[model samples]
Target: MPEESSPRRTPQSIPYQDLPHLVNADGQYLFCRYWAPTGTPKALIFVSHGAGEHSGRYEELARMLMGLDLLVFAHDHVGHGQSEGERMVVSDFHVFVRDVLQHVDSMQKDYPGLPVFLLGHSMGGAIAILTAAERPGHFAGMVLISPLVLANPESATTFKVLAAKVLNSVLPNLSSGPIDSSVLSRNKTEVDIYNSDPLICRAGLKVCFGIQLLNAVSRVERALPKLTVPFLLLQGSADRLCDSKGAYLLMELAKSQDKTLKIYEGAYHVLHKELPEVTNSVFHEINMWVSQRTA
Candidate 1:
């Protein structure tokens, strides 16, 4: 394992604000936010947040990256955040990928010459990897935090998965049970915050969404060898929602010559919000990786 570099200097104070009402090709208004650095930015980080959770949860992480003079941007996926769409519903997974590409295109035009990096967590991680594969070399690199490359084994059986494909035809809108928020983080406070979060989806998964998600996972898994962009895969050894085995497979299968994987023992699904010391170390790991690249 690599060690953290020297203590980083506090980032200069910068205004944190949201960029709202951005229209996408789907003609829906989406919400996005950016943390501009105090000086020239060496890189741009576009964050794709997890399913059910909006981009707001990444404010702290963006701020830390901004301190290092990195420009950070994130948008709420359709139906997930302030974006206009059916609540927590997506007819197809490719819609997510298109939205991310739209944002990347706009960001590149706005900040030409600055390298852009993709950072995704959970479902966002899946989207980022798929998106990067779609347009190789568009992103300088990728950072995946507990990406959902495969379904949780405990979530369902082989029979259930096959049944889902059939049920999706008849009851696309059918809902499932609430996710176990407790397994998200060992920090009780963070768990409580997640449970109480109004933006976080408390409703069960819809049949159509489930089918699309499963299909997307399978597609990305097969597409792993197609990814040539350098990437960093981060995983928590204790995450129950997303198994680390998928991360291990991605590290082995991805064709990137500079791929790296860091598994934190005992960490939960959300590594950035674990214990104070643990979270700090995760931050340092990210900072070290991105800084080295930008340097």
Candidate 2:
């Protein structure tokens, strides 16, 4: 567990302000950001970004949520962003979960009575799913975007899985390979920005990290029956990284009676960064769904 930091508050009057700082936990410091709305907020939304990206990338999305009068929060995972850890390296995936849980625990203490929601993308989506399952009924709901419920099975063959396990055990810190960033979005600007971002981890994936992700998916799959909280899952049908089939399976297996899934045809992994018009529609759907629940 990480030492909880004092809840750092940002200026509420600013239209879209980000207060950045560090939080201590698990013998490391995590870079965190607090996005505050103009007035009293109806709810709090914690964003969990995908692998290789930092929370800073969500500034645009966070600003939009603030406009809707929601307090937004996010942190760079221990091994990613400006946080203190090896780039894209972790001995166990549970560390990510524990770090996120610790942050949420602090946020809950800071904002009592405010309905909390998890807005996770890609690997963060898997983290959100696992975290929600751990504390059923704790969250008002969840918003998952291109979540990594299951790895593309075709890419993760039995031989590769076994090889990963052995390599992870022997050389846990070894680099596996780099993720192709081109598949992230069709928007060239988004891709260029991502490529130019200094905080984005360009290191090859680590062996231990790969195994841990698979382990997380397997665990979440088995525990889906316990996830009864309302959730909205948005996916890109053409997402090559996180398979949409996993999202479909989650919708079918989760016991949530209020779950909804929307697949954007021909969209890539980063639907939120897709064409301006397409992303706007997705954001509108998110705002409406959350507003209805909070109302």
Candidate 3:
């Protein structure tokens, strides 16, 4: 996989000898990698990445789950990784979602009658929520990891919100650049690794990105109470970027017949690859959750 700040990580892809890319006659191809179980898959998961990250970041996780006999499908969002689009800017909100759904839609076609699960982290988590809310029946279950549903909402101010909207409206494709160093202290090691990593951060944001993000969150908030999909929300107690209260807000509004929330005592926002024990715990928890339905 590629490192942070670098271009997409072109993994040594292992083709699904039986499964191949679903390309259109127009030559538009969505980059997708699948890890299949030996026989027909028991379940399939569609993964999405966070703001500055790409699908490659989950390459190892995908392989690990595949070992557990689950198939995984991941694609770089419009501008994030091995996909066609403006580096980091999407002209339309649904374009990115299209990236996600296209992968799932293709997988469902490739593997008919298989239960499908959805998983997303950070920005991806927000996208997952909105996507599932819109198409709840398309998935059997969904998981959110330190989802950016309301990042630092405690600090939201009229001026800040107005400024974000104004800036995005006036300059739709402008980027605000990298994050503040103060926020990076959550885990200097991980932050440092992210800063130094080459596979990530290929694109900055467009002014429209801010508007798109704000709109996306607003949509998720509005749809929160309408979601009928089985879902779980996981947040890191130490994740200052996304608070437990934020996760609670989701729980209060979730309409799912079965919805659960787990707060990691001292974990940071990057739960997927935090300390080994933390990471292992999350992996096990996710496996157990999905296993209950798929395994």
Candidate 4:
């Protein structure tokens, strides 16, 4: 029976039907984006964006990736950007991981038998790690930029403690701050753009969201030893948000024989949007790495 269904609208008051979107297990509509290559695609790439950011932040990166004849697809995680749900809110980090798997699985159906790669940054990197861990041998490789590994003791314990503290606070939801201002990139222009980007949730995230990421970091540590998927780990030596040591820890712990680590000297987090030279270097590295593997 075709019941009269109401139109689902994005946060921007636009109808979902008018945009490329998908409904997850929670029945929330997630805004999606795809970049098709000019020629036959050699592989499929899924991008998982960081906290307080959306999938469209990956535009320049996606354009470069498509030039490699790779089909790149991504969706804003629920609660961020144009996707439905409370802004910057998620009950658990696994919700993010499950959504990625769901999106990737759905895309796999569209382009069957092609190699799949996971590309992620920051917390999105944590989601990519857990997703790749969940389905072993499914991914050809992963391109992780300053991934939130949380392998260090202080990094692990600090978030857990801080999240616990925030939970007891009276105004957890109202505890918004200019976090994205200081922690993202060294390039001021990109930072300025991010500040004004309507898709990004500058309203900040909740404590429960912090707890979920802490959960993911712990889960990622457990999954690392069993990881066998080939990956290129990109990190900035001077990253303030996620420590550089996590990259070293991953290289030592992950069971993948093809693991490669590239740490940019004196650079900051968000290497893709870093100083012009560093950003170019990052793009070049990813291009060569994925092209070689997919070829």
Candidate 5:
């Protein structure tokens, strides 16, 4: 039977039928991952990985959650990893958040009445924040690590934001500087692992992409004051990728009466994969935080 010759595929050229995926409203296939416990799940979690990276990087953290009877699910954002689209670029910032809402809704229907929580890191944190903000009371809580609530002064200063806006219309594809992976973690081993991860996009963020990020930052600033979901924020004082001040501001600005912010003195951005002690504490804190809320 000559049925289908042009089936859509992933970045690796694997047919979408061969793997777990969700088609976004835009019809792009987003590769998804699921970690279900051996027994009935106590709750549901949606992990949103940072930009330039896929959802697979959260396996270690997902496994930790699995043991706690939490079903963890995530997807590679459009334009990254196995997802369909250009690397490090999205048509608009809301596209990412819209996709997250779809994935979460699908999971919720399968386990009706199961409390849902959002876990995000770096750029993903912006997506999660905006998602929870939109739904208002839908999510039981949120776990954020080094979230990008504020634009980096050095990178997105007032002048640079204006310059980038002008440059975007003309030089939208111009290369924004490459990220310093060294600042991602203090553990050299994890850094090496990340450096070698083929799924991680190493290309410099484009001017168009930077503009979207700035848009996200501005939107986050507007939403924080109205945000009321209980959240646990983990920040690293020495983080270079995402400043801890953003975490502080989220703590101060959000109207959540049950929020907690934990600061690691000298850890880097990727606290989930940071130094052993910091990572351990980060995991311990999230585990306890979610467990208490789901109760």
Candidate 6:
């Protein structure tokens, strides 16, 4: 394992505010964070973080959303962040759906009149699609960043899929491969910051993670065309995790006439934080899309 501390990230503290959480709706605490200005908000965005990472890592983006007049609330999906339970472990896929719904219900109460939008990244991206698909009428729109719509060749091989499914059913606790490439492969700065961020992780997934992932993929495939809400699919052309094929296919399959799909060439998995100039252009294009769509 590499050292957990690196000097390249901008470090700051995230303040805690009122967050309503419950487990299985059974009275156990499911941790979450909320940020918004004091006035009636323009929008309420239910943000979901990626796998093996907590909601804390999204402070920058959350702040930006708040600035955009959007109230943001994100939970460290059960077994993540300050939530109770082991990280990267799940017994069934339904638990994920239940937890996400719980948070959405809470957000509806907490930010009373705002139109809600869903934003998801990586693993959370898949969950967002799955959860939104189940309750297709719940949100004003969805913004998927580097969504894991379909598994890559590595995850799609015949034997690997069966082996993963069988192992997940038998031993969901068994740890799998690395969470992601070493921090060194991308920007040394990002790797350093991620490794150093007490909130980020070098740990990989357990079988439950694999199980939920496969389940999410299957459900999203069938639910794609059923979704009629406006959507924005964002993917990095150079993303190594979420492939572009599924993203493009989803755009084509979506029933929404207002959907837009944009691929940022040469940008890696983290387009939001891609190198400065690249990040600016990518976001600029996204802003342009939003402006035209919202008009």
The models' CA-based lDDT, in order, is 0.84, 0.82, 0.72, 0.88, 0.90, 0.70
1-295 in candidate 6: lDDT tens per residue?
A: 8885532211122222234445546444566778886776777777888877778877777776676667788887766666655666666666766788878887788768667778888788887887777787777888888887876667656335655566646753465677565422245576667677665556755555676777777777888888887788888777767777888978888787778788877677776666776667656665555444434
Scanning candidate 2 in windows of ten residues, the lowest lDDT window is 8-17
RMSD of each: 10.2, 5.8, 6.3, 2.3, 1.7, 7.4
In model 2, pairs of residues that clash are 2-25
Clashing pairs in 1: none
Measured by lDDT, the strongest candidate is 5
| Alpha carbon RMSD to native, model 6 | 7.4
Write model 4 residue lDDT over 1-295, tens digit each, in one string. Answer: 7997878899999999999999999999999999999888999999999988999889999999999999999999989888999887887788998999999999999899999999999989999999999999999999999999963455456556667677777656544344657667889998899888988877654567767877887899899998999999999998877889889989999999899999899898989999999999999999999989988
lDDT of 1 by residue, 120-166 (tens): 99999999999999998888999899999976886646426645566
Clashing pairs in 5: none
Evaluate model 3: give its lDDT.
Answer: 0.72
lDDT of 3 by residue, 215-268 (tens): 777787898887888987888887766666768888888888989888878877
Lowest lDDT 10-residue stretch of candidate 6: 7-16
Candidate 4 residue 211 Cα shift, in angstroms, is 0.6
TM-score of structure candidate 5: 0.96
The Cα error of candidate 3 at residue 97, in Å, is: 1.8
- Say which candidate scores most in TM-score: 5
Task: Score candidate 2 by lDDT.
Answer: 0.82
Candidate 3 residue-wise lDDT at 7:
34
The full ranking of all candidates by lDDT, starting with the best, is 5, 4, 1, 2, 3, 6
Task: Report the lDDT of model 3 for residue 18.
Answer: 31
Per-residue CA lDDT of candidate 2, range 95-147, in tens?
88788888888887888889899999999998899889988998889999999
Better-scoring candidate (TM-score), 1 or 3? 1
User: Which wins on lDDT, candidate 3 or candidate 4?
Assistant: 4
